[PDB]
Symmetry: C2
Subunit: 295 residues, 2 copies
């Protein structure tokens, strides 16, 4: 059982999401979805487990995505999502059933890297959990053409046209900047899930992003921001066969963390299946174990 809980940002935007409350006053986990994904995809299964084990759990749609406010639509600014998490933490910490001293930031894929950026600046975050985080986006060979495409979109917007939209992965599993396994098995699998005409419980999901998302991704240096995360206990869950975010890149980032940390590799899992199938129950139990051990 969950209730709809809305969080206001400092610029007046409403973040909308699901809040799985627990009885009494207990800790809270705030879950951020992956790139352009909505709260209804996969995460409600994890939240019910978190809730049954005594954790208030909040899954939300990030700015301009799903049920949440934000214009232009599906313009993914990771630094803005990280800042919004500070405002989300504020509202969730004020809820009656929430112990504000026991806040954990949980993120999957893109949302895991966004969560770490928020934890670097917000000491209210007592624990960080990153599932298959993505730390790079541009293929060097496609940079110049993607840049030119971004500029021409700006000029097109200055002439009155709408911001150019496109799927994060086309039918060939590709995208202009080559992110997240574009041109390989991972991008093809990503398109298969995002483009499927299936009821996933998320009417407001949209398999399109604004092209200017790639402009924000060009500024973002997440590997440098994660170096600021030097106090928050961090748990990283990496799929062994991640074809969208190279496991070695995730492992290189985990190496730099000097504080209390824990690494878990999900054998035989990919970017999208790391929290599903056999072994997924043991992985989720390890997440709550790590939080309680550090909360």
């Amino acid at each position: 059982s969950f209730q709809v809980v809305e969080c206001k940002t400092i610029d007046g935007i409403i973040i909308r999401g699901r809040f799985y409350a627990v009885d009494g006053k207990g800790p809270a986990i705030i879950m951020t979805p992956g790139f352009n994904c909505v709260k209804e995809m996969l995460l409600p299964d994890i939240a019910e487990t978190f809730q049954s084990q005594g954790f208030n759990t909040y899954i939300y749609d990030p700015r301009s995505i799903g049920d949440s406010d934000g214009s232009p639509k599906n313009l993914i600014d990771p630094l803005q999502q990280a800042e919004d998490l500070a405002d989300i933490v504020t509202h969730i910490s004020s809820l009656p059933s929430v112990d504000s001293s026991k806040i954990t930031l949980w993120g999957m894929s893109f949302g895991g890297t966004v969560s770490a950026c928020a934890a670097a600046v917000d000491r209210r975050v007592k624990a960080l959990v990153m599932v298959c985080p993505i730390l790079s986006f541009y293929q060097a060979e496609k940079r110049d053409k993607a840049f030119l495409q971004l500029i021409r979109d700006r000029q097109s917007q200055l002439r009155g046209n709408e911001p150019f939209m496109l799927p994060p992965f086309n039918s060939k599993g590709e995208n202009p900047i080559g992110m997240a396994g574009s041109g390989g098995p991972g991008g093809i699998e990503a398109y298969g899930f995002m483009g499927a005409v299936i009821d996933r419980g998320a009417p407001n999901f949209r398999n399109k992003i604004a092209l200017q998302t790639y402009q924000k991704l060009a500024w973002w240096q997440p590997k440098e921001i994660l170096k600021l995360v030097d106090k928050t206990p961090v748990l990283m869950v990496t799929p062994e066969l991640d074809t969208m975010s190279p496991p070695e890149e995730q492992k290189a980032a985990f190496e730099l963390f000097p504080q209390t940390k824990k690494f878990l590799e999900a054998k035989g899992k990919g970017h999208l299946t790391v929290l599903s199938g056999e072994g997924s129950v043991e992985v989720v139990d390890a997440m709550t174990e790590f939080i309680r051990e550090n909360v």
Copy 2:
């Protein structure tokens, strides 16, 4: 005589500045001022020399600064300033006297680093001039305190209050993050500079500026500038941006480049006084040589 020229951004914000036109059609230099500085500080003298040598020149107040649109006021987002430059390049390139194939980005201090970020993405920028670029902002000892103050400003705003404002340099020359020589000679010189014809100059910034500086990693973005001819002018005695940091970034550039160290000059005096004429002529010569259409 200069004319007021406005540049619309993709989100509808109006950027305002001075345009120094030349007869006929010719190259254009877009000058970005330093941290929270207005177009009337120092730069008009440089633009008149550029104009007399055949260069259209556009000095502008960045977003939320001076005469330009932008809210909240004096919130310095360098990444947004970099994106705004793409729109500024678009409007300046459309002007009758401007050769759209001969656009040069020019920046001083903070504005020099912002110009490099815009040059990394826009191939219309045919040359880059960076004057005393600043490439780091946080002192490690002040990081956690500044981060906590930023979160508390967010909680204050969420209760309905205006964003917390403060001078970028106090009377001791300090600021919460330790940027631009805070606590030493650099900060005191910047405090005196900010403290004494721009009606909309405001000696204050939003605290949330420091949140934007925390995300910024310009040393990594400067690595993307691998094609644009770049001239860097570094003061030998820069007390606000370490010369070693400026030189280290310059040495990484693989393309056509030139480095000039202004002997005995500081962050704010690099383009003033003795030897400043030769530095400006070195800029015009680098631009004529590298941006020929």
